[PDB]
Amino acid sequence: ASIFRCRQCGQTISRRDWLLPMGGDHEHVVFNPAGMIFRVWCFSLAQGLRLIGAPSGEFSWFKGYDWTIALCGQCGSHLGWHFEGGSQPQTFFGLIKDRLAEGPA
Ligand SMILES: O=C1CC[C@H](N2C(=O)c3ccccc3C2=O)C(=O)N1
Ligand SMILES: [Zn+2]
């Protein structure tokens, strides 16, 4: 199981080989201001998304990064966020682990 697809429609999104240990773990669990919990997996790279609007620094979970919502490009399901404007790396993807399906290439 080396590739991740959108759990709702099957759109190709990312790969196990593209997981990124930010802060020493690719997995981060975080809460938004509405108290929703997200088990976030960091990826260096993703595809098949649509990044919505312009970046925002408000409530950013990752120091020095601004965020844009990442929808599945096919079905519109909220898969995570694209993070940017930071350093080493300048950008990365934080994707919600239970909204993805993992399986064979
Ligand atoms: O790093 C992030 C990404 C965006 C995320 N976020 C949300 O998931 C959310 C839902 C409702 C209102 C405001 C927010 C918000 O800033 C958040 O809390 N931090
Ligand atoms: Zn989808």
For residue 92 the two structure tokens come to 């990365």
The one-letter amino acid code at 83 reads F
| C-alpha 55: how far from chain center | 14
Mutate which of 30, 32, 52 for ligand 1? The one with the most ligand atoms within 8 Å of its CB, which is 32
Q: Which residues are annotated as a binding site?
A: 6, 9, 25, 27, 72, 75
Q: Which residues line ligand 1 (CB under 6 A)?
A: 32-34, 58-61, 67, 81
Question: What secondary structure, in 3-state letters, does the chain show?
Answer: CCEEEECCCCCEEEEHHHECCECCECEEEEECCCCCEEEEEEECCCCCEEEEEEEECCCCCCCCCEEEEEEECCCCCEEEEEEECCCCCCCEEEEEHHHEEEECC
Domain count, the chain: 1
Resolution, expressed in angstroms to one decimal: 1.9
Cβ atoms within 10 Å of 37's Cβ, excluding its own: 9
Instruction: Residue 52: give the domain boundaries.
Output: 1-105
Residue pair 95/14 in contact by the 8 Å Cβ criterion: yes
